[PDB]
Structures are given as C-alpha cells and as structure tokens.
Amino acid sequence: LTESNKKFLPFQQFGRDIADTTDAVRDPQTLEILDITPCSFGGVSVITP
C-alpha cells in the first residue's frame, strides 16, 4: 500500500486501470488513497563459467 499523489472524487471507493485491474483503493476511515501493487515475482538465473 503506497501513498499515492492522485485524489479521488468523493463518491468512489475503488480504482482500476486499462487492464481492468484494481490498483487503487481508498481507506474507509480517514480518506487515504492507497495503491495496490503485486508483491514480487521473477526467476532465478544461473551463470556458469
């Protein structure tokens, strides 16, 4: 949950993108807009001499 710099209109709760993925949410207590980001993924690569 990263502190975003974009404000939300005072009738919305969620936020999506072009790919229809919910990456923006609003905390229901003191009106903070927090982004949603995938944690971590990848693959281990081995370099052999």
Next chain:
Amino acid sequence: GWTAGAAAYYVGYLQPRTFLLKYNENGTITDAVDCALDPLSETKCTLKS
C-alpha cells in the same frame, strides 16, 4: 381562481444502450459516443478511440 407563477419541467424515459465514456485525468466524464445511433459513432466506439 388561482395563480402559480412561472415554471416548467421535463420528463424522459430511459432505455438500455451501449455507451463509450471518455474520462480525463481527474476521473470526470467529458464526452459520450453511442454504438447504435450513427455509423461514424459505431466506428468510433468499435475502435475504442
């Protein structure tokens, strides 16, 4: 014998239609284009542009 000043009201009926909505950087609707009204509107809404 009575008076009521000057007033006017309009009443309309809604029907289900497909609309393509334009959003700005503030997340507010600016323009709407139909898909079953004009061939130009259908071409605009099919290309998503």
Next chain:
Amino acid sequence: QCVNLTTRTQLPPAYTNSFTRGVYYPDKVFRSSVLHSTQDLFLPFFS
C-alpha cells in the same frame, strides 16, 4: 384530506428534442484517461 378540481381550458402537451442530456456515472469506481464501454440504462441522444 383532499379536494377535487374543476374542468377548465388547458394546453395540450408538446414535444421537444434532447441535446446530449441524461448521462450519469454508471459505477462507483475511478477511471483516469480510460475509454470504457458499459451496458447500462441511459437516455439516447437526440431522442
């Protein structure tokens, strides 16, 4: 309680044309720079 009215001379209703009216937010979500199409009940343009 209520009372009844009396017969008088009225005006027949007329018909006018709408001009890009009847558009509302179809959902409670936020979209920025998104051209999104949804199926919901609106008012057709020039109807």
Next chain:
Amino acid sequence: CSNLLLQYGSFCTQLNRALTGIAVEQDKNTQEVFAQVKQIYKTPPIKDFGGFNFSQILPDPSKPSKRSPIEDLLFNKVT
C-alpha cells in the same frame, strides 16, 4: 491449480522453450545487422569533406546522448 497442471507441465515446458527460443532469436537478430565491424572508428576533429555537410547524420557532442538529431527525431517520432 498446480496439482492439475502437473498433467500439462510438458505443454508448459514447450511454451517456455518456444518463448526462450523467440527471445534468443530476437537477441541474435541485432548482431548480424549492427555488429558488422569489430573496430570502432572515429571522425576527424576538423570537418573538411570538400563541401559535404555531414553534421546531420554524425553525432553531435552538444547533447549528452550519442544519437544524431535525425536519430533523436526518429526516436521521438515513434512511441
């Protein structure tokens, strides 16, 4: 989902192999196009070519990028 993909792990191996081959193919494709000379040459400091203006295609040291103004314009033209 992975337990049921145990029966399709061979298909996933084929797709991963195809994607790796595609990646190494696009990696190799640049070598036969741009890496034709193994020596990096340079232009003389004095640009006296008899009248031929080469400043448009040659890189300019005024900008921090090595791209020529033609190549920088090409970069800005395509998204």
Next chain:
Amino acid sequence: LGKLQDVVNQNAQALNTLVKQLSSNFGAISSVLNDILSRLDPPEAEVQIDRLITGRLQSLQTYVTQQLIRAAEIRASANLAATKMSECVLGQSKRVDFC
C-alpha cells in the same frame, strides 16, 4: 514510421487480449478460480477448474503460435536488413532497384 508502430501496437494488443482473456469464464460459472474455490468444495469443483485450465491453455497456445509467426516475420525482415547492410552500406551494390 508505420512498421514499428504497427508491430508495437500488435504486441501490446495481443498482451491486452491475453489479459482480457484471463477475465473470461470459458463457459463456466465464474472467471477467477479463487471464487469457485471459496464457494464450492474441490471434490465438486474439479470439472470447472479443469475447463478453466483448458481455456487458459488454449489462450496460451494461440498466443505462442501468434508470437512464433511474428518472430518468423521479424527474422525475415532482419535478414533482409542485414543483407542490405552488407551490400548497399558496406560497399556499392550493382543490383539495380535494390538499394
């Protein structure tokens, strides 16, 4: 520049098509497997999960096939560009209407 814009748009549109294909049900009652895992027990939900797996596998196979065709086209274009680089740039080509 037409060709670069078209190939970039084709790759991006194929990736977005795969993304939106992930949001499809493929004839099942839901798209996401988490909803069916929470709402239905696995001893009765294996058929729908298998159908979702088959649909996503078909989508992946079609994506791989299109990517392979595009990679073959890109390799052909790169070979043509390499031959032109070797001939018209690295010397003078006697081939008329080639450079």
Next chain:
Amino acid sequence: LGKLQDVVNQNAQALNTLVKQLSSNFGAISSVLNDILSRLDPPEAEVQID
C-alpha cells in the same frame, strides 16, 4: 558446429516430448486406456477414452 546440431537436437527433443506426452493422465484417472478398458464397463470406459 552449431547450425547443424540444433536442427537435430530440437527434433530429437520434440520427439522425446511427444513420447512423454503418452505418460500424462490429461485430467483423467489413468494414462493408458487399456487399464480403463479392462477395468470399467463400456459406458464409463468411453468417457475416459474420449
């Protein structure tokens, strides 16, 4: 030699994967259809063969 070796290695490994594909259940309860044919009645057998 690199060019002459990949055109054989890829074909051999694809044939190996094609052979290995017969060892997968493919969502069924067994790999070989003969086990179902000798174990199940024909109405239930035909579903597994399909």
